[PDB]
Each structure stands twice: as structure tokens, then as C-alpha cells.
Design a protein around this ligand. Sequence first.
Ligand SMILES: OC[C@H]1O[C@@H](O)[C@@H](O)[C@@H](O)[C@@H]1O
Length: 752
Amino acid sequence: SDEFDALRIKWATLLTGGPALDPADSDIAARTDKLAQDANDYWEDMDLSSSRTYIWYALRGNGTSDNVNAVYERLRTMALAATTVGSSLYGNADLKEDILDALDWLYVNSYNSTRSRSAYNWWHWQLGIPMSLNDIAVLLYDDISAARMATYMDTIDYFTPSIGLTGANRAWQAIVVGVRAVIVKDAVKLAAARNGLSGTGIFPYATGGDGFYADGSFVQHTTFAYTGGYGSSVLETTANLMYLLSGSTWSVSDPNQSNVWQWIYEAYRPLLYKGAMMDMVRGREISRSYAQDHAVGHGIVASIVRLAQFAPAPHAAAFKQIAKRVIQEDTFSSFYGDVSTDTIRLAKAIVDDPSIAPAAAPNLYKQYAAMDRAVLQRPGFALGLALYSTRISSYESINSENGRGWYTGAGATYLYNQDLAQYSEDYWPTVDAYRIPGTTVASGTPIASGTGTSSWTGGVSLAGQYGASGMDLSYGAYNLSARKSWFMFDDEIVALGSGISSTAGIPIETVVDNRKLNGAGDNAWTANGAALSTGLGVAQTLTGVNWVHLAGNTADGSDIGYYFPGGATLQTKREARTGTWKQINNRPATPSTAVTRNYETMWIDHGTNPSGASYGYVLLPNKTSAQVGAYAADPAIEIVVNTSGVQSVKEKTLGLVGANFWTDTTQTADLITSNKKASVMTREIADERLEASVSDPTQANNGTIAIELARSAEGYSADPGITVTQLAPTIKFTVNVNGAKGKSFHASFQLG
Ligand SMILES: OC[C@H]1O[C@@H](O)[C@@H](O)[C@@H](O)[C@@H]1O
């Protein structure tokens, strides 16, 4: 028994679930039956004759990365069904030989060192295929002759001989070099893989470019928010590799590995909602039918469970609590339904352990300044806000993926509630891509993929409880500019727009919402107390509307109210939309099956060539018709200002005042006065204390922000970087935002 021999068995168990895997388990049973079934269909119509010019007719083409890569995945699936306890194909020797022969056929006809290491698509040749190959190698290790194993691992070492990329890609090389190292028992290479994790975009926090940021953000491809896309892969790969090496000669020792624990707390947890990984941070992956939010979420929890196996306390235990909660929260799609059998085994051990209680649900506001994202988590609902600027791009679309993601990150609001299916069930291929909720656009007109021209994108966080965000809008593809702000309070979100001007000669609109409805598309809804028609295919204009209520898809926990201060005119339509994933993902493997979903879409029409137009609306999650009606009668919020210079809102019951200042001039909103671009929020406790949070959203101010609060104080306490120069008769202080990178600075004053 070699050490490598031990590692190999360890990895094999990670793939099959080991010999302990209990096939009596209801969920484990399902996972294997499905694996065996899939393995059969593949084996069944597989071309076995030595004359064959392809393995599977439907995948022929020894020069198409996609096809070849897909052929290895299938072989991988077959190898698993032949080594997983409970599988009807377990041990079947014929199946094993067929897999091996197919592998030989590929080495000769398509996968060998005579090909360009950089031949499109490079990813497939250097990472995708090798990862599948190693897995087969490890699973059929005993049945693989030294001769064959040579042609297998030599080719791999050819394409990927070392580690030198960043983020997800560097991690992928690491798992490729490492797993191969264990197979060919090369201690050098293996030590090389372990060290690769300390590289760019992984263990060490990034200050720019790809990687994880100290504020929890995750970037990939230089300018895209990717926590849920490439980020998922980095987490999965890093967890799998760290677990393999853990407790061995090549165990990870880099001190930065502790940042991995923080990833889970600050980078992932806040973006998870009852099993779903928010689409706003999944990039172009939202266009993948096999990777909708809950499916992706399950993958992330699977990694957390993996980390829980070797993570040091208290982390290990905390990870268990978080996984247990999410597994119990997701009643939409079973967690055990789409993760590895080993994950199921390990997960069940946590859920059935009574000594382990579910973690508390997150309740907070967080500003992901490095990736122009913000998230609000409350009991009963979550709000995700996607923005873009000179630092982050509008959306990514490469390799024929995400062709209609134009506005998915242009001041887009994503509401999460009891309807856990809202963004799954083919939302993306059917939703009107020109009307993404919360955005302001030129009707039916797209924009390009790229960074913006304004740096004012971000917001402030008040003690991680409340917050405000803003985005200076100016599209490049066409003339349209506006100031958009969002104020997040306890149970309402206030959206404000001003300075909406255009010369594009195209109608401009602001999408209040665009929700997928139930199967019948008959959700009930009211306006100003009047029941509205619920028939599909009906468009209608609601004039002089103060409030609207829309019943959700669940009995409770998914209703949404809309309040319009000062009244508004809404353009609406309830229609059935048809689409195909092929339309937004034009790759071979995408199903071209048509699907139909129902929608209720509501927008404000600003007319053509508007000048200084504006809007204001409040989202009231989980309230009944009556409640929304009551609210509109005696609103808790109050619009302090909504000009192109400053947008401010007040929350009378909580004593909160938020303000976004758009220009570098002295301006005043309620009790707040600022001399520069800033996002400010204050909380006043009658004759007790006054709290304030300030941030420089532009991340370009090399000096200070001078703030003045119209209140008299007796004393203070503040974050370093703040200098109070006066407490009476009014409060005055400056904030050193030089190199702050969009962070919030807090100060607390004792009132007379
Ligand atoms: O499509 C091949 C491969 O490309 C990478 O860039 C990522 O998008 C992966 O998720 C994907 O599997």
C-alpha cells in the first residue's frame, strides 16, 4: 500500500461514495437507478465494431471540442455506473472493457499529443477532457494495463503539464495535475498541484482582476460578477482538492487557506436563498438549461458539505448547520436529486444528526462594492440588485451563450420569496429580455457587452442592517441617461429615478416588474382596490394608479405590492411567451424544445425623447391587498428629494434617512449636507443617538467627503478614517475615502 494508493482510494470514494454507500436509502437508490439507466442508453446505442469511425453517431467529429468532451463525459458516466454500489451495472466486466476500448480508439483517432494545445476550444483539450479522463482512470485503475495507462496520462501531461492561470482556470489545472499525479504516483507534480492553490485568484484576496475580494465579491474575466458561475467551480474544485490532500504528506499548509472559510460566510451565504444561487452573479451561465439557480445552489451546498469533512472547528460545525438549513429550506427541488452519491451519503449524516441544528437564516444588507452588486436578506424575502459601471461590464456573452442578457445587470432588481421557482422552470428562455425588472431602457432596443462610462455605481451600508445603492446610467449603444437609486429598509424597497433624458428618438420605459405567473396565468391582482381582469393575452393601461397588488404563485409568502407616491400611469400586459434555450444558448447540446410561460409585465412609459423625466415606486413584499391599501393610505416612507443632483428617502417609523448625492457640489437632503459625490444613510433615535454611514461609490475620490448633520451632539465614536471637527451647534466631519474601494464608514453620535 502506497500513500498514493491511499489517496487514489480516497478520490474513488469521493466519486462513488465508497463501499459503505447504502443502496437501501430512498434517495441514494434514485440517484443510482438514474445513473444505471443513463449508462445503459449510452452503452446500448454505442458503436462497438472495430470499423467504427465514431463511438456515438450523434457525437461524431474527431475535431469538435464539444463532441469529444461530451464523449468523455459519457464514458465517465458509464465508468461510474460500473463502480458505484447499488448500480445494476456494478462490476459488469463487459461494460468495463468496452469503456477501455473506446478510450483506446480515442487516443488514436482524436485525443493525443499530435494536436494543437491551443486549438479551439482550448478549455476542452486542456481541462474538460483531462478531468473526465482522470476520473475514469481512477475508477478503472485496477483493470487498466500499464500500456493503456501510459497513452492516457501521457496525453494529459501534454496538454496540461503545469499550473499558471488564474481563478477558476488555475484551480482546474490544479485538480488536473494533482489527480494525474496521484495516478502516476508523481510526488513532484502532486506537490505542484497543492502549491497552485496559493496562486492568483484562489487563496490570496485580489485587489483588482480575477479572484475573491476582502468584501466577499468574486470576479472572473477581469470585469464580471461571477460568484455563482466561475466562482462555483473554484469553490468545488478547491474543496475537492483540499479534501484529497488533507491529512497527507501533501496537505495544504498555506495560511491563506483560512480565507476559504470566509468565502462561505461572506461570498456565498448572502447570495443563497432557499437553495438558489442568485442569477445576478452567475454571468453567462444563466443561459444553461442544466444549470438554473437551484441546481447551481445544490452544487454550492455540496461543496460546503465537502469542506465540512476536514474543516477545523468551529468552521466545520458551522458549515454543517448551514448545509442542514438549506437542504431543509429547498422544497422546490430535492437537494439529493442532483449531487454526487458521496455527497448524498455525507449530507444525510448531517440532516439526521439531531445534535446538529439548522443555522439561522441570514438577515442583513450587504454591498458587494468590488462587483457592483448588493443584496438584502429579510425573513420571508430577499432582494438582489445587479449594477454595472466603469469597473464591471453590462453582461457577458461568448461562445454563443447568453445572447439576450443585455439588461440583466443594468440596475436589475431580483425579488426572492416563497415562489422558489420564479427564476427556474425556463424563465430565462421565455422572459422578455428587453424588459428586465427595475431597469430603464429604450423600448425593445439592446445594448452592448462592456463597461460603462460612469464610476458612480455602488452604495452605503448602515451597520449591515439597512442600505442604499445607486447607479449613474448612460448607455453607449444609444443616448439615454438617468440617475437610479434604491433604498433598502425593513420591509419595503424604494426605487427612485430622475434626470431621465434621451435624444434616441425611441420610447423610453422603466420596468416596474415582470413576474412569471402560475400555470394558468390566472394570478389575482388589484389596483386602487379594484379587481383586475386575469385573462391571458390582455394588455391594459392603468391610469392614476396609487397601488397595485399581485397575488403570488404560492398560497402565502409570494404576494407583491407596489406603491406609487403621487400616483402613476402603468402600461401592463399579461401574456403567454414561448421560447427555446437554443435561442439564448446556440450550442449543440442545448435542447431546442419549445416551452411556454406566463407573465405579468408592468412598466412606466416615459415617452420619446424625454427630458428630465422621473419615477418613484416602492416594492412591498408579502403584503395582502388590504395591507398594501393601508400602506398607501399612511405610508412609512417619504420622498425627501428626487432630482438629478440628489435622491433621498426617509423612513418615518425607523428614523432612517438615505441620500445619494450625484455631483461634487454642496447639496442638502433633509438633515444631511454633503460637498461631494456620496451615498449616505443615517438613523436617528429621538434624543438618544444619531448614526451615520458614508461611502464614496466612485472609488475615485483621492481626498475626502465633508459631511454636516443638522443635529447637535454631546459626544461621538467613529471608524478610523473619519475626523469629527464639530459637534455643536451642528455635526461636522470628513471621511478619508482615498483608496477606500467603495467601503462604508460608520460614526455614532450621542445626542443632547
Ligand atoms: O463550456 C466549457 C466550459 O467553459 C468555461 O469557460 C466555463 O464556462 C465552464 O463552466 C464550461 O464548462
